[PDB]
């Protein structure tokens, strides 16, 4: 059974059961500290009370977000989502995302929408994100370019292995102003994503 707990700074010692996943990024030590310092309340971990913390890490995942923009563009951004291998395909990943919605639709945040960037090739995440009511707002060409790839010079060449989808869920307060059915046709450069 999953209980949702604050992520404590020392829990990074207890996240190996989460972070050896080939797709989960172990961010620099500086990066984890930043999120707790500016936005402490949205940085939480999923804990299994079924797993004894004396013997094993009970952390099944954690959520990293930021709030950004102003006025109409004031939103919460889903930066990273991970779930321990033992606890996949049991809708825990949905629960964390829903847990943001209750947490960000109310005071003090009252965000207009939640957005996230997902690789265009990530059909597994895409179908997950669609199913909760998120919609693609635009395709971000070259969002994940390496220094060797350089800056994308044209919006005409698209690569599902290199482009990211700007994926959005509009809140009730937004009245769907920040979402669109045809966003998969809209393309922008990484520098045009500004808030």
């Amino acid at each position: 059974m999953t209980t949702i707990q604050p992520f404590e700074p020392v829990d990074l010692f207890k996240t190996n059961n989460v972070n050896l996943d080939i797709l989960t990024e172990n961010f620099p030590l500086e990066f984890y500290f930043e999120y707790m310092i500016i936005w402490p309340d949205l940085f939480f971990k999923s804990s299994e009370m079924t797993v004894d913390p004396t013997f094993k890490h009970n952390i099944s995942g954690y959520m990293m977000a930021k709030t950004e923009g102003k006025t109409t563009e004031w939103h919460t951004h889903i930066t990273a989502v991970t779930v321990a291998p033992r606890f996949r395909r049991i809708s825990l990943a949905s629960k964390l995302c829903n847990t943001l919605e209750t947490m960000t639709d109310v005071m003090p945040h009252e965000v207009n929408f939640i957005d996230l960037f997902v690789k265009c090739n990530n059909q597994l995440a895409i179908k997950l994100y669609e199913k909760l009511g998120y919609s693609v707002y635009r395709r971000v060409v070259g969002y994940y370019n390496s220094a060797e790839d350089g800056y994308p010079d044209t919006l005409k060449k698209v690569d599902d292995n290199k482009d990211a989808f700007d994926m959005r869920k509009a809140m009730a307060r937004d009245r769907n102003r920040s979402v669109r059915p045809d966003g998969r046709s809209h393309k922008c450069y990484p520098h045009d994503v500004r808030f």
Partner: protein, 796 residues
């Protein structure tokens, strides 16, 4: 300008070009007669030239010590005195000067500088005094006075958790009273962070107080009217249970559940409350289902209800749960928690009623882990190995559950045969070749190779784990334990790239924490600070952090590399630990990644003897390292003398064998005899070291004993203090055989594996290997890596 001199004076000091320094400082002293900074500089240059010739008491203690009357408000003078006193191990004097400086010249800057300096030193007491001084002079500060009272409370909070041994019983109550009152005077609280710290102050510094629990519940419940905070969730649940109020516990859980918080902790406390409120079982079940619907918790809530209301799980609640979860990997964990209340035959009947099409791989894995059927991991794997080709390349196969079951069973043996170790390796590799991202089998492959000392193939495996950042603290122990005597190859990517990159956590990130620590206080992120406080203390004391440095000192010794720089950090790291006023080590190694009972496995499984390291073994290795530095001078140090008294008050020789290998123990005793006894008994001690058998059956001990022998004898041969002829006769003669044997051992080790392969092909091993539908791998590839290891040894 203050800075520009300091490097130049120290850079002249560091080159021992002392003579000009006094002229230049004297030139400064004629220009700046009143700058105490330069008078402190004169002492620092003085001490470095001839420590035993300059009276520490006369020049430092009376002006600057705990009774020092010479007080300065110049931050640079205070900082330089602090760093000097720390360098002398005078940690109380180091921060005392700031308290006196701030006492005589109180200012926001100086109060801030003092707080920052105390923060670096882990002196949780001194922040509390420093925090109060900022509050009085906050009018020139950039944060509201209210912040500094929370800073004091957090400093008081910090002391009680990590430095309680520093507080006398009267002082604790005083600090406890001071913390609460200063936060009371700031009510109403402005934000959730302030509420948490007040709740934190109350909960830990006033435990078991009835009024305290009532106050925390009242303030926390009122906040839940508008906002949802998980810390207040934790606070309210604890104290409402302490209040033994079933009515309030139901109200709290209901209010939080209705807000959409699917929490089993909420559900259980809701469930616990309702029974004491005599609510009907059906009423609670419907209410949970109505507000939460079908979730993992709510189906399991029916099981918890069945136990709480009838002491047995009913078939209906279990089947409803199982209807969706029987073929989910979490199923076994969920039901094992309830094993004590679930009839196994009833569970067995339901699991057998599912269709053969629904009895998928995961369903059988749950059957296996629940012990409902005898172990059939061989047939189950063969039934389900066909899933390996259809699953996502990035997806983990549950087939490892069956193969690891075989692997653990062989590995539970107290003394695995050389064939037995290779048998697991052969099984796992073909599976890892099919499941390249499965870490569970991968770690065992990693673990198995290190026990055989075949480091390069395991390192071939380690690089694919992409271990980085915090994982280096918890996971590097598999390969960086005792590296100096397992794989002494300075040119290998293992050391030059992997080991070097993994040190960035301790050399850069650890150093950087205070600047991040500072901002959290300024950013009022108090709720994370106390957990953020914890990381550093563990990180200095981290088993991995200390082990790697000490092994590197031996490795740098074995390779005849320069150690002057290496020791200085060790002394700096030692000083950094000592200022914390609690000398201990922190075991952060994640043994749970390999097995659930691994705490039971470590003490019994020779497979991890190479990684079996405790505080005592870590402390002993340090003392050996510290000795080596003193050996060229030949004087006994107070530092070593104080540490040796901290070792358990038993006869030395037993303690070593209980925490170090026989060859390490024999080496360890040798170094004392020159240090303690001026080396009378080396003739017998060297002979004992040489007698330690190097046999082909010792696996990792083959390399370990050889290189520990090599490292010791080379150090002694380098030791210019050994003048006695006949001891020197043995030392060079002893080395002479050691170089000669270098190849005799390896061929016998190389010989031994090949017969084990022949053993594997035949009898129980081969027949399972035919049964496994897996064919033994090629010996030569293993031989080359060993013969690569053998090649490395000769070039030593």
């Amino acid at each position: 300008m203050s800075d520009k001199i300091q490097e130049e004076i120290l850079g002249l000091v560091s080159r021992s070009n002392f003579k000009q320094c006094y002229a230049k400082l004297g030139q400064l002293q004629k220009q700046f007669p009143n700058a105490l900074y330069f008078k402190i500089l004169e002492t620092y240059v003085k001490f470095k030239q001839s420590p035993g010739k300059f009276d520490y008491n006369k020049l430092l203690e009376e002006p600057y010590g705990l009774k020092g009357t010479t007080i300065t408000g110049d931050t640079r003078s205070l900082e330089f005195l602090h760093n000097f006193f720390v360098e002398l191990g005078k940690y109380d004097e180091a921060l005392h000067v700031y308290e006196r400086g701030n006492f005589k010249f109180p200012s926001y800057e100086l109060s801030y500088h003092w707080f920052m300096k105390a923060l670096e030193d882990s002196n949780y007491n001194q922040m509390s005094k420093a925090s109060l001084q900022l509050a009085k002079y906050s009018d020139s500060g950039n944060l509201p006075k209210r912040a500094y009272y929370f800073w004091n409370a957090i400093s008081i909070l910090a002391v009680s958790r990590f430095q309680e041994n520093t507080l006398s019983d009267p002082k604790k109550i005083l600090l406890s009273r001071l913390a609460r009152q200063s936060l009371l005077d700031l009510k109403p609280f402005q934000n959730v962070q302030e509420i948490i710290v007040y709740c934190l102050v109350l909960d830990e510094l006033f435990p078991q107080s009835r009024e305290i629990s009532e106050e925390i519940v009242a303030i926390t419940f009122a906040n839940f009217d508008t906002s949802v905070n998980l810390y207040l969730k934790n606070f309210i649940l604890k104290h409402t249970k302490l209040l033994n109020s079933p009515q309030k516990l139901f109200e709290v859980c209901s209010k939080l559940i209705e807000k959409g918080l699917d929490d089993y902790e909420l559900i259980t406390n809701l469930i616990d409350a309702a029974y004491k409120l005599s609510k009907s079982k059906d009423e609670v079940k419907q209410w949970i289902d109505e507000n939460l619907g079908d979730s993992r918790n709510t189906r399991l809530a029916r099981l918890k209800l069945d136990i709480m209301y009838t002491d047995s799980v009913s078939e209906s609640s279990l089947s409803y749960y199982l209807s969706k979860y029987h073929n989910k990997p979490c199923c076994s964990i969920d039901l094992n928690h309830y094993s004590g209340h679930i009839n196994i035959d009833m569970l067995k009947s339901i699991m057998s009623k599912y269709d053969p099409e629904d009895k998928d791989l995961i369903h059988h894995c749950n059957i296996l882990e629940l012990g409902l059927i005898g172990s059939d991991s061989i047939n189950n794997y063969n039934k389900f190995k066909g899933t390996l080709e259809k699953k996502s390349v990035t997806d983990y196969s549950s087939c490892s559950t069956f193969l690891l079951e075989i692997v653990k069973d062989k590995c539970k043996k107290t003394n695995p045969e050389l064939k037995d170790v290779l048998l697991c390796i052969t099984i796992l590799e073909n599976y890892q070749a099919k499941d390249p991202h499965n870490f569970d089998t991968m770690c065992w492959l990693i673990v198995l190779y290190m026990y055989l000392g075949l480091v390069p193939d395991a390192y071939f495996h380690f690089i694919n784990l992409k271990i980085k950042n915090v994982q280096t603290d918890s996971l590097d122990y598999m390969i960086f334990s005792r590296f100096s005597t397992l794989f002494p190859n300075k040119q290998s990517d293992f050391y030059s790239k992997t080991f070097h990159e993994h040190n960035n956590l301790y050399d850069t990130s650890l150093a950087n924490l205070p600047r991040y620590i500072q901002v959290a206080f300024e950013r009022n992120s108090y709720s994370k600070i106390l957990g953020m406080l914890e990381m550093r203390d563990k990180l200095m004391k981290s088993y991995t952090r200390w082990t790697k440095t000490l092994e590197n000192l031996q490795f740098s010794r074995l390779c005849n590399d320069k150690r002057g720089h290496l020791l200085q950090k060790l002394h700096e790291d030692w000083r950094s630990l000592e200022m914390t006023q609690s000398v201990s080590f922190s075991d952060n190694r994640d043994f749970s990644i390999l097995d659930e009972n691994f705490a039971q496995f470590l003490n019994r499984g020779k497979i991890l003897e190479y990684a079996n390291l405790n505080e005592e073994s870590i402390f002993l290795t340090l003392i050996r390292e510290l000795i080596i530095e003193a050996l060229p001078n030949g004087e006994k140090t107070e530092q070593i003398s104080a540490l040796l008294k901290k070792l358990p008050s038993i006869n030395l020789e037993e303690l070593l064998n209980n925490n170090l290998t026989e060859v390490e123990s024999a080496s360890f005793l040798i170094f004392f005899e020159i240090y303690e006894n001026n080396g009378k008994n080396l003739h017998d001690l060297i002979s004992r070291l040489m007698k330690v058998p190097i046999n082909a059956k010792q696996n990792w001990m083959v390399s370990h004993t050889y290189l520990t022998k090599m490292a010791t004898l080379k150090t002694l041969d380098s030791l210019k203090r050994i003048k006695d002829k006949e001891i020197q006769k043995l030392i060079k003669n002893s080395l002479k055989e050691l170089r000669s044997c270098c190849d005799d051992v390896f061929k016998g080790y190389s010989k031994a594996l090949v017969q084990a392969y022949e053993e594997l092909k035949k009898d129980e091993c081969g027949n399972l290997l035919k049964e496994l539908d897996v064919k033994a791998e090629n010996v030569k590839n293993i031989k080359n890596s060993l013969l690569g290891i053998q090649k490395s040894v000769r070039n030593l």
